[PDB]
Amino acid sequence: RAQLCQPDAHGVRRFNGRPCASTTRYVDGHKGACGCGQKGSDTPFPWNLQKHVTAPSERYFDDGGSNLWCGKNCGKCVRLTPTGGFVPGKGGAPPNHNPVVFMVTNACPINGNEEWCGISGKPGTNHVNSHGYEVHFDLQDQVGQVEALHWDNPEVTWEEVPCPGDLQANYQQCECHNS
């Protein structure tokens, strides 16, 4: 048993009652779906390639909707805490369980990401991905910031939290701020 969050009666994986999420890492260089770069260009601000930022699965990104530009949850922050688990063959156990806060600045669409981001309802509606998680967080890794955490697709618990001050200030520059 590599996955430590066990499915509840509705199939949703949890760990001591808290909901779990799967995670992956990505590199693509795009500005992304919250507009965190210069208007009209596909160029991200450097901080949006360097900091702890995430592309959640589509139905969380837009709070049940399908908009892939200025989703409802752009600019939210989530605290992810490793459980020690992982999907066998698709991750590993991390060296510690320090929690890390990430800011939503992009989206992981269902199309082309069915295994991890193919979840057909928002959290709380008992819809899960193919590995049993109600939400997925794809972590930006342009500058190796996920490797610096030594995270290889860890299973995590997840919660929304207020953003740290520096990430709030960064988000103010994104086009979707106040949309």
Ligand SMILES: OC[C@H]1O[C@@H](O[C@H]2[C@H](O)[C@@H](O)[C@H](O)O[C@@H]2CO)[C@H](O)[C@@H](O)[C@@H]1O
């Ligand atoms: O589709 C989500 C995300 O997947 C990333 O690839 C995963 C891959 O699915 C998994 O089998 C392997 O173990 O890990 C990699 C890295 O997390 C891919 O890099 C992303 O572009 C994609 O958005």
Ligand SMILES: OC[C@H]1O[C@@H](O[C@H]2[C@H](O)[C@@H](O)[C@H](O)O[C@@H]2CO)[C@H](O)[C@@H](O)[C@@H]1O
């Ligand atoms: O990059 C600006 C462009 O972002 C689009 O979102 C993409 C994002 O670029 C990509 O990194 C991620 O993997 O997929 C999302 C969703 O397809 C956004 O949809 C566009 O409106 C925007 O112009």
